[PDB]
Amino acid sequence: ARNSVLRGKKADELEKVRLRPGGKKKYRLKHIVWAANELDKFGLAESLLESKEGCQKILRVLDPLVPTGSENLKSLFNTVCVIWCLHAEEKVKDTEEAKKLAQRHLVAETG
Amino acid sequence: ARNSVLRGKKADELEKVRLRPGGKKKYRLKHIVWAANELDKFGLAESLLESKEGCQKILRVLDPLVPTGSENLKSLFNTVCVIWCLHAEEKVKDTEEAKKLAQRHLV
Amino acid sequence: ARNSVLRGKKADELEKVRLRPGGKKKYRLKHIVWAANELDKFGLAESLLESKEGCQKILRVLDPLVPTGSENLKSLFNTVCVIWCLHAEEKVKDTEEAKKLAQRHLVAETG
Amino acid sequence: VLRGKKADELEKVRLRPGGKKKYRLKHIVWAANELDKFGLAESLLESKEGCQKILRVLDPLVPTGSENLKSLFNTVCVIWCLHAEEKVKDTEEAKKLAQRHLVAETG
Amino acid sequence: ARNSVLRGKKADELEKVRLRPGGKKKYRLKHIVWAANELDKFGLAESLLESKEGCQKILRVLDPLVPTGSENLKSLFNTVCVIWCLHAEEKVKDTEEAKKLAQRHLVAETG
Amino acid sequence: ARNSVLRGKKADELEKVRLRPGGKKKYRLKHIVWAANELDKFGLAESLLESKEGCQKILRVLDPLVPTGSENLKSLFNTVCVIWCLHAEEKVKDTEEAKKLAQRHLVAETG
Amino acid sequence: LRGKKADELEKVRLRPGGKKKYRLKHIVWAANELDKFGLAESLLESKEGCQKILRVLDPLVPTGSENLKSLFNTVCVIWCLHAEEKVKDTEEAKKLAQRHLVAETG
Amino acid sequence: ARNSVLRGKKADELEKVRLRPGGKKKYRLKHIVWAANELDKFGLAESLLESKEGCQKILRVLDPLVPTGSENLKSLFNTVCVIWCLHAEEKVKDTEEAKKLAQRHLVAE
Amino acid sequence: VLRGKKADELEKVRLRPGGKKKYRLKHIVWAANELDKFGLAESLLESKEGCQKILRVLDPLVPTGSENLKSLFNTVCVIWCLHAEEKVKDTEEAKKLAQRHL
Amino acid sequence: NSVLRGKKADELEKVRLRPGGKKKYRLKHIVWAANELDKFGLAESLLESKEGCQKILRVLDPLVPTGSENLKSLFNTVCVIWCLHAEEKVKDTEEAKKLAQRHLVAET
Amino acid sequence: ARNSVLRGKKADELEKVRLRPGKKKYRLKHIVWAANELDKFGLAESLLESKEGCQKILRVLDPLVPTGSENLKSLFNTVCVIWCLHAEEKVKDTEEAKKLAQRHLVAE
Amino acid sequence: VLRGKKADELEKVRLRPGGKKKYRLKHIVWAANELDKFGLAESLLESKEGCQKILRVLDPLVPTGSENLKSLFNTVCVIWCLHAEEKVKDTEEAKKLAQRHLVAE
Amino acid sequence: VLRGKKADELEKVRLRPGGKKKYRLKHIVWAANELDKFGLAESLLESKEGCQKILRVLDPLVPTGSENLKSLFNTVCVIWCLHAEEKVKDTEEAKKLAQRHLVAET
Amino acid sequence: ARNSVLRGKKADELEKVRLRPGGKKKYRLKHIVWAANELDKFGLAESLLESKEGCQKILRVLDPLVPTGSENLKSLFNTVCVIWCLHAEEKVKDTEEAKKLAQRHLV
Amino acid sequence: SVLRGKKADELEKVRLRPGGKKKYRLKHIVWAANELDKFGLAESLLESKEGCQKILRVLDPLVPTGSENLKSLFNTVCVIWCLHAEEKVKDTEEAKKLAQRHL
Amino acid sequence: VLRGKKADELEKVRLRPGGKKKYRLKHIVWAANELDKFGLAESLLESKEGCQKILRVLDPLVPTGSENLKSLFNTVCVIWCLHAEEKVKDTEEAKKLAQRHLVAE
């Protein structure tokens, strides 16, 4: 359920994150459920969205598939990055800002 | 707190309510916070948004003010109408379907 | 898997929490696995331990059951309280300090 | 059960947080008769401690319970605050206080 | 994702079970989605719906609450009985027929 | 908890399946726990081992990695094949026999 | 890989704390293993061709055989030679090249 | 970080190894942290605890000092002996069995 | 200035966004006499409106302000959130909530 | 439950909990004290005067030597409140506990 | 010069902004007036040439705005207009330009 | 900014009313870069009139200003006295002479 | 890449005109990484002449250039200003001076 | 007075703490008074000896002086470490065990 | 309680600064008393010329690297000592000299 | 004076606990010129051993020390963390570790 992933202030913080750097379209609750059903399509547990570590576990798995990834894959990656910034409570203003902060953690923990 | 007015499934159903009957733009949690601060601008205690009876009280304060109301007020009356149906668990797909169910109760 | 719930510094910060307010016996890695399998007996998802919101959800469910609860029930309650203090980055010295900050959060969100 | 000042104060507690309807004597008559369905002694409603015992018995069913079990649960919370002599304007505020005391006492 | 709970012949057969013993409106896919999202609230895993053994586990946790539960809880209890008969490959015509079969196995499982 | 995967007759039947086509050492409860804890590393939900449809699902996610995977991974693949026939109510003498039955359903499922 | 880059490779350890260092036979085994994958062995001669090999192998590394990791490990070292990033063992090379993988992906 | 030395099943498997042969106390993550900090006194690189070969190299530099060494040295030596067994995945019950399995291997090479 | 619930709730607020040290009554006494130094009225600290009159006076002074003004502007931000009955967990959460209302 | 207000509430917060420490009394301690009193059947209004606090200390004094950690906390907090009501300046709990106890052993 | 503040593609956009929420739109002399008005403050005219420098003018002038003269208030609002153009935030008048430039000033 | 006889005369002015430390070239360089942080042109420090304009912009902020603002304000008062050729022995005497001219105009 | 006085003078040039955010080491690391996307040598950033090689290569791309290219050209302008012993307050003062020497020497 | 620092059961346990690690000659009552005398000379409040919080305050003053301190200071530092362990109700057997645990609480 | 009688009145004639009009008050003595309890020093040392000499002796090495809170305390105790020593100083810097010449 | 990796890693450490202003090169330039006012060897900042050698000398002076002294002590704690290969996040978390290594010594 959407209440399990993001809830309370974290949901309000999500809807202040823009879908694109300069755009005006912002994230909504439907993005949370879509990413969960996206994970369920590939056998990955939805419960990883509920933690910054589980989100980091999602990113480590999806990253070797991004180069050949579809639009759903390349964007599910971006949605998980947004969720990680909210679990880590890092103020990002857009998807590209979430990718910058989430992949910064991904680069650093690699190895 | 936004978590007060609508939360969980209520916050999910809210975002499934279109701003206009045929239109595609649906509600988002920003509209609850705006409608709350509209109550604060009126002196009305914001806590009326948390119950369908408190919302019904709001609709009674504003319904005389609608025929001459402005753009923000006709929208606030419409926003609290959607919040009422969500509290009342009456499924509406848009704004005018909510006013129809909420004002049918105001009778 | 134990690595899924508590990993890295969260596991080390766990092993500095006393089992009792003054005792020298501290929490170890076997307590994490025990609490996870304790939840599995009652149908509760193990993944709720992965986040402080899921831990708080565990506590809301277990709280009406504590007055007539066994030792494993109370031990599970106290262990989940410890995990919450680690997900919330709260420095507790023992179980009683964990239950203090965890139930103070449970009381505050009640209503 | 409720007599004198406790009955006057009960009829100042709203049935819903935003409504106008207040509690009446028939609400206590309904709760005591409902307690009979649980084998619970009706004299428990006459004390703070007896109310805490009803709530400890009813709590594991509240998230799933019927609106009748909830109405019973809500009423005992209101009766608790009267015995606790703590000001409550409506039902959900009495719920907030009674379950607050319930969670804290639990150890 | 509804695909996980019931798929294939099970998804097709679910829409042959009537909600009411004499009624005509049969089960939908949206009923599967609702029952799964209800389980996320008692902390119970959505995954128990994907197996008859997990459906029997749900009924064990739910039966103490049936005497004083909401019709929502009764609907979830009844739907889980229907999903169990689908997993168990037992042919049922309506909800209360699956209710009797899932409970007959639940009662025979007692103790 | 081993419980959730295989139980009762399934638990007694697993320990009759030979690890090797001519071997004598048969499957153990600990093999179920190991395979379950390996999926938690791949991000694959542990719950897919509780149903035959989730076992076919694990096989689909695992088969691309079999040509270049570790023997630890072949063991997870082979064990899922054994757990599948147990859920599928199909008799096998050994592991390679469970592979042929589970992969036959996997081949006929392709498409 | 030839001459100068071969000398630099032979100062890279097989394991982060071991004593054995990389030899000519390691490239011979790696290029021969690439043939089993259809990968052109000339890819090993460039930092860009090494990037291509690593992109192909990454979705198999967490599950891969000890033979697959040896190929992945050796190509990571060769990437660092072409990238001219001083690595003293296999772990530092893998850590460094996979680092470059994650940053480049988008 | 302690997480760099032992993690996952390795961190779990560590806490099954008994400390003293008969005693009830077992290894905690606190023992890896103490060891790792103890090597910073020697200048011995701390990343050596992450490898069985690195653990072997640790024992090599330490072995000339054990006959006369302090209990700090003895404790540090024995802890690395178990860490090597975990990297090597050679099962062990107490500190004595790990000392045997580590010091067989150091003498053989 | 405060009492009862508002006094207890003030003491539940963290000075810094992660510590354990919490607001106290001496902070209210300090902010009371800080207003009396700039000539402002102390009774503005009893309302969410008079509070934001102070917050309006101090905002164009924050980017160059000393630690006292920065703490005064921040303490008043916490007092406003108590008056506005909007729950905050630290000084900066009260800042983001008081300035949103500016 | 504005059990303490005025200068007394401000004076409560300059009293250190343990002798030699820096953590001083909060309002959450007065709230906690009145909550423990309700478990005894005592009146929360007893904390409003020095005389009503002496009623508490006289009921708790026989329990002090064997008292649980929560009882010693209650008795000691009431001693500080008694010092606040009796207008007695104290640095820490032991100083407040000493004066309230001496006044307790003196009226006999 | 007027050039170095707003130029070309953005000077055409400035001429679409109304002085009141009014028909008369902003001119080029409005940039020059605001620049030569900063000259009375000693503020650098180079601050008008970037959105970050425009916020710097707003910060310096905001303590004066509540008590500011008619020339004072105008300078602030015009700098708010220039910031909205530098920041590529369209604004149909001056009042909305004050809103967009001030909500950024308060946030930082 | 400040050179010639003015730089020599600046270094005869005490940092604090009666200390041993006096004004140095580091404070004018610091004041010039501080001015940059405010959007005020460093060229204002070159004249008494530019220093006069600096103080008018700063004076509203001195009751609440940080230590860097008060000290940046402090140095400018001394610089104004040098440009105006008025004998000053320390910062406070410069503050008194500068603010006196500030209020009178 | 840069050390001594130059590394300290770098951490003092403001990024945008009118801001506070000054250049950092991560900006030099980032610029050296984007250069390898062009085949240029990271060692070019170590002299005013080598940086002039970069500018002449990026100068024709500046007008239509992306945000990442403009940032690269601007960082190299700062580095050239450091090597050429030219004091600047922000990136814009730097491009001004480097581009003017870019136009003068043709 | 000696008894105001440690008394009774805690005074018995003090005499059961060895002066040196595996030693056998143990602490005395004169060690309490002599340590209070060292505080008097230092100007420190002798009152800090009577609580584990005041003892930790003493050791926070003495710890920077330990790397160069007199054997007198190391004696006072060790004595206060033992008195803290007695106050803190944390059983030790020698000075070195009290040091290892008073410094554990010194962070 | 530290300074009473002619000493407390003699204190309020000592100028806080060498040349200036603002002089010492009662709040400085109570503040100097709490600075002592912050360190753990005996508050009663302020009441004597020798107890004050115990403080200045301990604090004087801390002067070169100390905050002005310590310097204000070092100056206050320097002045408290002058009053106990019956040395009629007129300002703080006049007191530090006479006091440190006794160290 | 640090170099490359240590200098790059130093700039990922914030001054405030949860602030944003991260450490710069001039926080080392200030601390290097500050130690010379004690006579402590400037080169002690080049090693975790010399860093703890610094913290030993300064720790007695930090209860009463000015913020100039504390800023020196707190920066050295950050520098020791770099030589110890211990990823901290801010000054306080670095102050913690370098001080508890010192207390154990």
Task: Name the residue ranges covered by the structural domains of chain O.
Answer: 6-101
Q: Is B96 on the interface with A (CB under 8 A)?
A: no
CATH of domain K2-107: 1.10.150.90
Chains that touch J (3 or more CB pairs under 8 A): I, N
**CA nearest P64: which of O79, O24, O64, O42?**
O64
H15-45 in b/e form (b: 16+ CB < 10 A) is: bebbbeeeeeebbbbebbeebbebbbeeebb
- Contacts with B4 from chain A: Cβ below 8 Å: none
| Long-range pairs for D91-96: beta carbons < 8 A, 24 or more residues apart | D91/D13, D91/D14, D91/D15, D91/D16, D91/D17, D92/C111, D92/D16, D92/D17, D93/C111, D93/D17, D94/D13, D95/C111, D96/C110, D96/C111
Q: Touching check for A54 and chain C: CB below 8 Å?
A: yes
Taking CA–CA distances from L52, the nearest residue in chain K reads K42
Distance (Å, rounded) from C-alpha B8 to C-alpha K61?
45
Out of G55, G62, G102, closest to residue A110 by CB: G102
**Residues C84, C52 contacting (CB under 8 angstroms):** yes
Cα–Cα dist F53/F49, whole Å: 9
DSSP symbol at I65: B
What secondary structure, in 3-state letters, does H83-109 show? HHHHHHCCCCCCHHHHHHHHHHHHHHC
- D17 and B51 within 8 Å at the Cβ level: the answer is yes
Q: Cβ contact (<8 Å) for C45 and A50? A: no
Residues of chain A with Cβ-Cβ distance to F59 below 8 Å are none
Pick the CATH number of G4-104 from 3.40.50.300, 1.10.150.90, 3.40.50.1820, 2.160.10.10: 1.10.150.90
CA separation for the pair J58, J53 (Å, rounded):
9
Are F and G touching by the rule of 3+ CB pairs within 8 Å? yes
| C-beta atoms of P99 and N107 within 8 A | yes
What is the DSSP annotation of P28-82?
HHHHHHHHTTTT--GGGGGSHHHHHHHHHHHGGGTTTB-HHHHHHHHHHHHHHHH
> Cβ of J14: how many Cβ atoms within 10 Å?
14
Record the tokens describing residue J62, joined without a space: 């026989």
In this structure, which amino acid lies at residue G67? N
CA distance I80 to I13: 13
Q: Which residue of D has its CA nearest to C111?
A: D96
Q: Which of E86, C106, F93 is nearest to E102 (CA)?
A: E86
CB N9 within 8 A of CB N50: no
Topology (CATH level 3) of domain D5-105: DNA polymerase; domain 1 (1.10.150)
Partner-chain contact K55 M16, CB within 8 Å: no
CB of C40 within 8 Å of any CB in chain F?
Answer: yes
> Which residues, including other chains, have CB under 8 Å from residue K92's CB and lie 6 or more apart?
K16, K17, K18, K21
Q: What tokens appear for L87 in the block?
A: 């004998």
Inform me whether the C-beta atom of residue P43 falls under 8 Å from chain O C-beta atoms: no
In CATH, N2-105 is 1.10.10.60: no
H50 contacts chain P (CB < 8 A) = no
Q: How many CB pairs under 8 A join C and F?
A: 11
Distance of CA N93 to the CA centre of its chain: 13
DSSP state, residue H70: -
Fold classification of I4-101 is DNA polymerase; domain 1 (1.10.150)
B4 touches chain A (CB under 8 A): no
Chain J contact set for I9 (CB, 8 A)? none
- In this complex, is the C-beta atom of O82 within 8 Å of any C-beta atom belonging to chain P? no
Locate breaks in chain A with C to N over 2.5 A; list the residue preceding each: none
- Closest CA–CA distance from residue N54 to any residue of chain P (Å): 16
CATH number assigned to the domain covering O6-101: 1.10.150.90
Which residues in chain F touch residue G62, judged by CB atoms under 8 angstroms apart?
Answer: 41-42
Residue N28 corresponds to which tokens in the numbers above? 């005395």
Percentage helix, strand, coil, to 5, in chain M? Answer: 65, 5, 35
Query: Hunting for tokens 């996952």 — which residue is that?
Result: H8
Q: Per residue in P76-85, is it b (16+ CB within 10 Å) or e — as a string? A: bbbbbbbbbe
- How many CB atoms are closer than 10 A to CB K98? 22
Q: Does C37 touch chain A (CB under 8 A)?
A: no
- Whether the CB of P85 is below 8 Å from some CB of chain H: the reply is yes
Question: Could you identify the residue written with the tokens 């008048």?
Answer: K93
Residues 6+ apart with CB under 8 A from H40: H46, P48, P84
φ, ψ for residue I51, nearest 5 deg: -60, -50
By C-alpha distance, the chain F residue nearest G72 is F68
Per-residue 3-state assignment (H helix, E strand, C coil) for F89-104: CCCCCEHHHHHHHHHH
Residue with tokens 């105006």: L84
Q: Are F26 and F15 in contact (CB under 8 A)?
A: yes
CA quadruple N70, N74, N80, N83: dihedral, nearest 10: -140
Using CA atoms of G51, G54, G56, G59 in order, give the dihedral in degrees to the nearest 10: -140
- The CA-atom distances, in angstroms, between I50 and each of A74, I55, I83 are 50, 9, 10
Would the CB atoms of L57 and K42 count as touching at under 8 Å? yes
The minimum CA-CA distance between O19 and chain L, rounded to whole Å, is 8
Distance from CA of L87 to the nearest CA of I (A): 30
The distance of N23 to chain J (nearest Cα, Å) reads 32
Q: What angle do CA D41, D43, D44 make, to 5 degrees?
A: 75
Q: Residue C8 is nearest to which of H3, H15, H30, comparing CB atoms?
A: H3
| Chains I & L: contacts with CB separation below 8 Å | 20
Measure the N-to-C terminal CA separation of chain H; round to a whole number of Å.
Answer: 30
Annotate M2-30 with b (16+ C-beta within 10 A) or e (fewer): beeeebebbbebbbebbbeebbbbebbee
The verdict on P87 touching H (C-beta cutoff 8 Å) is yes
Give the CATH class of B2-106.
mainly alpha
CA–CA dist A48, A40 (Å, integer):
11
What architecture is the H2-108 domain classified under in CATH? Answer: Orthogonal Bundle (1.10)
Instruction: List C-alpha distances in Å: H105 to F16, F20, F40.
Output: 40, 33, 34
Give me the CATH code for the L5-104 domain, please. Answer: 1.10.150.90
Taking an 8 Å cut-off on Cβ atoms, the answer to whether F44 and A48 are in contact is: no
The CA-atom distances, in angstroms, between K100 and each of B53, G32, K72 are 37, 64, 19
Give the number of C-alpha atoms closer than 13 A to the C-alpha of residue L25, restricted to the C-beta side. 6
**Residue L40, SS3?**
strand
Q: Which CATH class is domain J6-106?
A: mainly alpha
Residue holding tokens 């990883």? Answer: A48
Phi, psi of E30 (to 5 degrees): -65, -25
**Sign of torsion over alpha carbons D90, D91, D92, D94:** positive
Resolution to 1 decimal, in Å? 2.4
H helices present in chain O, as ranges: 6-11, 26-39, 49-59, 68-84, 92-100
D38: closest CA of chain C, how far (Å):
17
How far off is chain K from L45, nearest CA to CA, in Å? Answer: 11
Q: How many CB pairs under 8 A join I and P?
A: 5
**CATH superfamily, domain at A2-109:** Immunodeficiency lentiviruses, gag gene matrix protein p17 (1.10.150.90)
From CA N14, how far away is CA K14, in angstroms rounded? Answer: 85
Q: Tokens standing for C37?
A: 């399998």
Q: How far is I98 from I84, CA to CA, in rounded Å?
A: 9
The residue count of chain E comes to: 111
Q: Which positions in chain N touch J19 (Cβ < 8 Å)?
A: 47, 50-51, 53-54
Residues of N whose CB is below 8 A from P100: 107
**Chains within contact range of chain B (3+ C-beta pairs < 8 Å):** A, D
Q: For residue F5, which of E53, M66, H58 has the smallest C-alpha distance?
A: E53
K57 contact partners, CB below 8 Å, separation of at least 6 = K38, K43, K47, K48, K79, L39
DSSP letter assigned to residue J20? T
CB contact (8 A) between residue A66 and residue G95: no
- Contact state of F45 with A45 under an 8 Å Cβ cutoff: yes
Only one residue has tokens 């501290």, namely C26
Measured distance CA(J98)–CA(H10) in Å, rounded: 56
Which amino acid type is present at position N74? K
